Design a protein around this ligand. Structure first.
Ligand SMILES: Nc1nc2c(ncn2[C@@H]2O[C@H](COP(=O)(O)OP(=O)(O)OP(=O)(O)O)[C@@H](O)[C@H]2O)c(=O)[nH]1
Ligand SMILES: Nc1nc2c(ncn2[C@@H]2O[C@H](COP(=O)(O)OP(=O)(O)O)[C@@H](O)[C@H]2O)c(=O)[nH]1
Ligand SMILES: [Mg+2]
Lengths: 273, 298
């Protein structure tokens, strides 16, 4: 059931820089750069260079998207207004409103105003591209309300403030409990996964050449001087739970651990793993 | 009484000197270095390192006008009482023969005022060379740097602010300045054997530079001291930007357990165990008991 994403744009839009930063078989998500292909595809991400002039790029956008609505009119169209790290907010906003306006204005005159275009301000020196991908992938998971109800029963009953379900390779969150998501918590959790994976690549690969950094027993506890605790546990070979809680809730670590195994078996049954 | 050591940081303007210093000693990230101003004359910085060592860092603006003063009206000020010269080279530089004359004039003023000074050459910005060419270009320059360094030994390093190689060079430089650094390597050897670790790194708390390490079985990644310094340093900066200060970490899989923790008031430790019949509790109580003992030293 792996969600299918295609990524498209002109030479120098930033694509393989985006593919590199996010993914470097081994994701929860099936991802590819570019009327056959668009037949079984969830989402098409059109990347525009925002540091460059976009008039050329807006044109190709309208062609490739009208092309693919024809084939599969359920496909999600996602637009990455990209390399915005090169501009001032004044310039970010005006481009956003400008690409928004013309991309949508161009779609009225093809009589295709029943074709939704979501927008994202992305950058590779930024987490925006993770946030952006996390949003795109979440729309392609039909069992998202089940994952979100399971995290809710898990964190309620476990004294946990916030829980993200992560794709370990990409640092994309496929689900979170119902609490509002502060994007700084999301970034911090992504930076934890990097720390866990890069220390696991160096130590704990097996006496011989190699093995795998992430495995059934992959666990981390990070303690922050404001008594915040971050707690990562393997769920599946793709997916890791990361929890944010306080030291005080973490005193009841036995109850969290026992309940975690109910949540984990429940996640397995959802994915028929 | 803490040993005050004079480090000169010198190179042509824009080679990356302040950039390096701002990453190792001031908690910058590589992207932030794009906003640094040119350095006017010398920018003095006093780094309390372990509380028996102070590093008097001399960040010397590399404009032509500034260097010319350093060779003339300021020659005594600059080149007297120098323990370490760190000299930075822009690998992307067009003016190699002019870069060499400025380097050789620093060597000649160092040979006259501080001959027993320790010379390091940093072949810098290697992120802008193609990766298949890097080892090639660095060997060529090293060989030239050691010929043109005349009666003096230089130790060369290929550095970038965009990876671990910066931590490799500055770990190496600071190791040569730490007082009784062999005394410490023994006291850590002790702790490691008693606690029964595969490996123990000691880090300066502020910089996360490696100052001491124990292994048994030579491991595959000889570059791993720098990588850890870099990985953890970056996480420490995400913790203060995004939440609060880092305090401790525990990482595990089926092959290893790793503990990272405050140690002395001036250091962090990382213990690595390949899970025998040791509880978590025994390792934790050993790490706590060993603080008072390392505390003494400082
Ligand atoms: N690609 C790359 N750029 C670097 C590197 N180190 C520094 N830079 C950049 O190059 C410039 C160097 O500026 P500084 O660090 O202020 O240079 P400096 O050597 O102190 O210059 P002066 O004060 O004029 O002597 C900045 O844009 C840095 O971000 C590096 O390793 N790689
Ligand atoms: N500053 C900045 N540069 C970017 C970004 N994305 C890509 N680039 C740069 O844009 C250039 C083109 O990127 P690349 O991925 O090769 O384009 P592609 O043909 O779409 O793969 C490269 O020099 C990248 O470093 C970004 O978000 N910010
Ligand atoms: Mg400078």
């Amino acid at each position: 059931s792996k969600p299918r994403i295609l990524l498209m744009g002109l030479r120098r839009s930033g694509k393989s820089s985006i593919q590199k930063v996010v993914f470097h078989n081994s994701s929860f998500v099936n991802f590819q750069i570019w009327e056959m292909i668009f037949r079984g595809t969830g989402a098409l991400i059109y990347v525009i260079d925002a540091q460059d002039d976009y008039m050329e790029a807006l044109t190709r956008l309208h062609i490739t998207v009208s092309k693919a609505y024809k084939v599969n009119p359920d496909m999600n169209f996602e637009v990455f207004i990209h390399k915005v790290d090169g501009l001032s907010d004044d310039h970010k906003i005006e481009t956003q409103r400008d690409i928004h306006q013309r991309a949508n204005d161009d779609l009225a005159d093809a009589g295709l105003e029943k074709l939704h275009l979501s927008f994202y301000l992305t950058s590779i020196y930024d987490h925006s591209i993770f946030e952006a991908f996390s949003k795109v992938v979440q729309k392609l998971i039909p069992q998202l309300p089940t994952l979100e109800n399971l995290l809710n029963i898990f964190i309620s009953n476990s004294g946990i403030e916030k829980a993200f379900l992560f794709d370990v390779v990409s640092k994309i969150y496929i689900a979170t409990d119902s609490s509002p998501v502060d994007m700084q918590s999301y970034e911090l959790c992504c930076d934890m996964i990097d720390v866990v994976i890069d220390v696991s690549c160096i130590y704990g690969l097996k006496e011989d050449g190699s093995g795998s950094a992430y495995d059934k027993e992959s666990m981390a506890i990070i303690k922050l001087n404001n008594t915040t605790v971050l707690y990562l546990k393997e769920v599946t070979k793709f997916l890791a739970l990361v929890c944010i809680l306080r030291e005080e809730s973490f005193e009841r670590k036995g109850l969290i651990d026992y309940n975690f195994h109910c949540f984990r078996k429940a996640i397995h049954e959802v994915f028929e793993v | 009484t803490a040993m005050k050591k004079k480090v000169l940081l010198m190179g042509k303007s824009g080679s990356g000197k302040t950039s390096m210093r701002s990453i190792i000693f001031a908690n910058y990230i590589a992207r932030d270095t794009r906003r640094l101003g040119a350095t006017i004359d010398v920018e003095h910085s006093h780094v309390r390192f372990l509380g028996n060592l102070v590093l008097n860092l001399w960040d010397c603006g590399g404009l032509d006008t500034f260097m010319e003063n350093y060779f003339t009206s300021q020659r005594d000020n600059i080149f007297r009482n120098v323990e370490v010269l760190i000299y930075v080279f822009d690998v992307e530089s067009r003016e190699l023969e002019k870069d060499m004359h400025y380097y050789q004039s620093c060597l000649e003023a160092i040979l006259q005022n501080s001959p027993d000074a320790k010379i390091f050459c940093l072949v810098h910005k290697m992120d802008l060379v193609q990766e298949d060419q890097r080892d090639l270009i660095f060997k060529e320059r090293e060989e030239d740097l050691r010929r043109l360094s005349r009666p003096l030994e230089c130790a060369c390093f290929r550095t970038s602010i965009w990876d671990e190689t910066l931590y490799k060079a500055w770990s190496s430089i600071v190791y040569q300045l730490i007082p009784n650094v062999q005394q410490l390597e023994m006291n850590l050897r002790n702790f490691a054997q008693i606690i029964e670790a595969d490996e123990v790194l000691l880090f300066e708390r502020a910089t996360f530079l490696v100052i001491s390490h124990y292994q048994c079985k030579e491991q595959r990644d000889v570059h791993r001291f720098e990588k850890i310094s870099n990985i953890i340093k970056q996480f420490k900066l995400s913790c203060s930007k995004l939440a609060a200060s880092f305090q401790s970490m525990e990482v595990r899989n089926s092959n290893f357990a790793a503990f990272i923790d405050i140690f002395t008031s001036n250091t962090y430790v990382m213990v690595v165990m390949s899970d025998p019949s040791i509880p978590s509790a025994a390792t934790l109580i050993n790490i706590r008991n060993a603080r008072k003992h390392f505390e003494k030293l400082e």
